[PDB]
Design a protein around this motif. Structure first.
Motif, PDB file in Angstrom:
ATOM      1  N   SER A 130       0.905  -1.153   0.000  1.00 57.80           N
ATOM      2  CA  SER A 130       0.000   0.000   0.000  1.00 57.80           C
ATOM      3  C   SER A 130       0.950   1.210   0.000  1.00 57.80           C
ATOM      4  O   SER A 130       2.129   1.082   0.213  1.00 57.80           O
ATOM      5  CB  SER A 130      -0.956  -0.043   1.248  1.00 57.80           C
ATOM      6  N   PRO A 131       0.423   2.406  -0.184  1.00 53.66           N
ATOM      7  CA  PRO A 131       1.315   3.561  -0.277  1.00 53.66           C
ATOM      8  C   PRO A 131       2.316   3.729   0.860  1.00 53.66           C
ATOM      9  O   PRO A 131       3.457   4.152   0.585  1.00 53.66           O
ATOM     10  CB  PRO A 131       0.322   4.770  -0.442  1.00 53.66           C
ATOM     11  N   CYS A 132       1.943   3.387   2.092  1.00 54.35           N
ATOM     12  CA  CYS A 132       2.838   3.591   3.245  1.00 54.35           C
ATOM     13  C   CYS A 132       3.471   2.327   3.751  1.00 54.35           C
ATOM     14  O   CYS A 132       4.234   2.416   4.720  1.00 54.35           O
ATOM     15  CB  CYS A 132       2.095   4.248   4.423  1.00 54.35           C
ATOM     16  N   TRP A 133       3.208   1.192   3.113  1.00 54.30           N
ATOM     17  CA  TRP A 133       3.711  -0.101   3.668  1.00 54.30           C
ATOM     18  C   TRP A 133       4.417  -0.954   2.682  1.00 54.30           C
ATOM     19  O   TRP A 133       3.903  -1.306   1.613  1.00 54.30           O
ATOM     20  CB  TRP A 133       2.530  -0.909   4.216  1.00 54.30           C
TER      21      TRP A 133
HETATM   22 NA    NA Z   1      -1.020   2.834   3.147  1.00 53.15          NA
END
Ligand code: NA
Ligand code: CL
Ligand code: CL
Ligand code: CL
Ligand code: NA
Lengths: 245, 13
Positions: free
Chosen positions: A37-40
């Motif tokens: 995901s965008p942050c992970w």
């Molecule tokens: Na994320």
């Protein structure tokens, strides 16, 4: 990766390159990971278990080269380094070998999708391809067991999933392989993951969806007969991923 | 200490 082919990040745009900064100030490559995901980013606990301090690490997305910048790449610090509390068997056949890195740039941001940065889908629970399916693996790991250097250019290869029955034969890995692992190898044993590929993705296509089936975890040698690569079976870890993300 | 290919970034082995 032993054998295989060179590639660029456009052909595996979820691939994350993870480095560690040392006392000297020198920065060295650690392991691969995958942007889910965008942050992970998801990777393997064994890549970090001896040095669990998040501040030590740097993560790049959009990167095709090991020690040179790729146009478009993004650089992140590690806001949280989440290792699996049930990790064990650090000596070889690692259990629960899965880690999450929450990424955060200097400007406080996460990944921004581009031609070179994209997420990969997670499998649905307990839903893996049948043995004999061809999947791909990607990494900056060694090209030969005996090499001292890692390749400067990203690599990929194709390996086939091996049945748990085959992998658990004594002349393969016996009881070292668990239901939470998958084995994969080449029929000629001529291509494989190697040191420095850990944490990276095993991607398989299911029902037309590219899916993160595995995380490069362990294996004896590299590209040796009867010694497949062993991968964390992502489809058995969805509650853990969900509950830490 | 760590054996095989999955031993990056280890203190020992
Ligand atoms: Na994320
Ligand atoms: Cl366990
Ligand atoms: Cl398997
Ligand atoms: Cl070995
Ligand atoms: Na590129």
């Amino acid at each position: 990766i032993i054998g295989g082919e060179f590639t660029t990040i456009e052909n595996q745009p979820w691939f994350a390159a993870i480095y560690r900064r040392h006392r000297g100030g020198s920065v060295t490559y650690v392991c691969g990971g995958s942007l889910i995901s965008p942050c992970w980013v998801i990777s393997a606990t064994h890549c970090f278990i001896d040095y669990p301090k998040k501040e030590d690490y740097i993560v790049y997305l959009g990167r095709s080269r090991l020690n040179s910048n790729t146009q478009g790449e993004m650089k992140f610090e590690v806001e949280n380094l989440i290792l699996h509390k049930d990790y064990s068997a650090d000596t070889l056949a690692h259990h629960n070998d899965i880690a999450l890195l929450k990424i955060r740039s200097k400007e406080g941001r996460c990944a921004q999708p581009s031609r070179t940065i994209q997420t990969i889908a997670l499998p649905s629970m307990y839903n893996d391809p049948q043995f004999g399916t061809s999947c791909e693996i990607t990494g900056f790991g060694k090209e030969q067991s005996t090499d001292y250097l890692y390749p400067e250019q990203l690599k990929m290869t194709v390996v086939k999933l091996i049945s748990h029955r085959e992998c658990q034969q004594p002349h393969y890995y016996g009881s070292e392989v668990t239901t939470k692992m998958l084995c994969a190898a080449d029929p000629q044993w001529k291509t494989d993951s190697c040191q420095g590929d850990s944490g990276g993705p095993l991607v398989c296509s299911l029902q037309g969806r590219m899916t993160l089936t595995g995380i490069v975890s362990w294996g004896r040698g590299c590209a040796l007969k009867d010694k497949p690569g062993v991968y964390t079976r992502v489809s058995h870890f969805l509650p853990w991923i969900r509950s830490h993300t | 200490c760590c054996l095989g290919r999955g031993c990056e970034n280890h203190r020992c082995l």
